[PDB]
Amino acid sequence: DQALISEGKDLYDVACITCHGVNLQGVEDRGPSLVGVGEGAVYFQVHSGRMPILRNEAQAERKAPRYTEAQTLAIAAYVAANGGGPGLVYNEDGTLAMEELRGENYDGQITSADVARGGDLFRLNCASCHNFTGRGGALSSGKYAPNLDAANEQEIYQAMLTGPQNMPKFSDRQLSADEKKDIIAFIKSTKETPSPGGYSLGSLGPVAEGLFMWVFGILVLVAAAMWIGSRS
């Protein structure tokens, strides 16, 4: 549409201006060129609340979104008019796919055969930078791979499609549509499934199970020993 670009550049001209310049060419040490990033990179950065940057540091943070859905799409439309790259994934009718990228053979619930394959893909070269169940991990110097709980499925797709920050970029040629959908299936299944037995201590692993016991577990038993025995 035309009005979309029209009112999508107004929001750009009063926000994304100091960094990125007038013609999306970038500023020296403020922000990169938005030329060729695509309609899918603006969606991920703006909707997820990442953009705009407030201060330069090791790594930009996810925060409260500044713009709504419609405003995000207008800015995306304006940006993509300056030479477009990856676009948003749609479904049947004109609409953003959300609960459709929950597996290749997804109908109304996640197929157990999709999480199996998605799990190995998400662990082939994606379970390292982050965590096992995407709980987050550390990086070089003040950077990190964030916890995956806060992202919707469109954000996941657009995250891998146009690798932001240090996150490597995964094109369709590398990880096909089906593979990406399987990865989303695994991500959304491990998040939304309670632990079969116990209170999963943030799923961090041996470091969280050892703090619960070595600092809190032993203290209760000491208190029991202090109750039975004497102080003299």
Binding site: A113, A116, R117, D120, L121, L124, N125, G163, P168, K169, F170, S171, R173, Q174, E179
Partner: protein, 102 residues
């Protein structure tokens, strides 16, 4: 400790760069119970120099030309899964292929 699966290059084998498609065994139940076929399934597949965007990384494994089961000559009755899983399970076989920005 001198050798890995890539040493096959020295003795006139053509090894490709095999990308892991993480393919699993497929269930096929028909009249004699249920069986996991894993035939016609290839977990390592050949990759092209356009399949990777700038500033990306992909783990590749030494896939010799003998155990390739994709492309124009895909045979849906050829079983190569166990050999490709031997390749992927080599202690020193994994190689990360990085396409750098220009």
């Amino acid at each position: 400790l001198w050798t890995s699966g890539w040493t096959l290059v020295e003795n006139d084998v053509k090894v490709y760069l095999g990308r892991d498609t993480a393919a699993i065994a497929e269930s096929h139940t028909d009249a004699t119970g249920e069986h996991w076929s894993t035939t016609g399934v290839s977990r390592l597949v050949r990759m092209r120099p356009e399949d990777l965007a700038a500033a990306s990384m992909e783990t590749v494994f030494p896939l010799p030309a003998e155990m390739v089961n994709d492309g124009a000559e895909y045979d849906p009755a050829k079983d190569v899964y166990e050999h490709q899983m031997h390749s992927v399970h080599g202690p020193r076989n994994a190689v990360m292929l990085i396409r750098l920005r220009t």
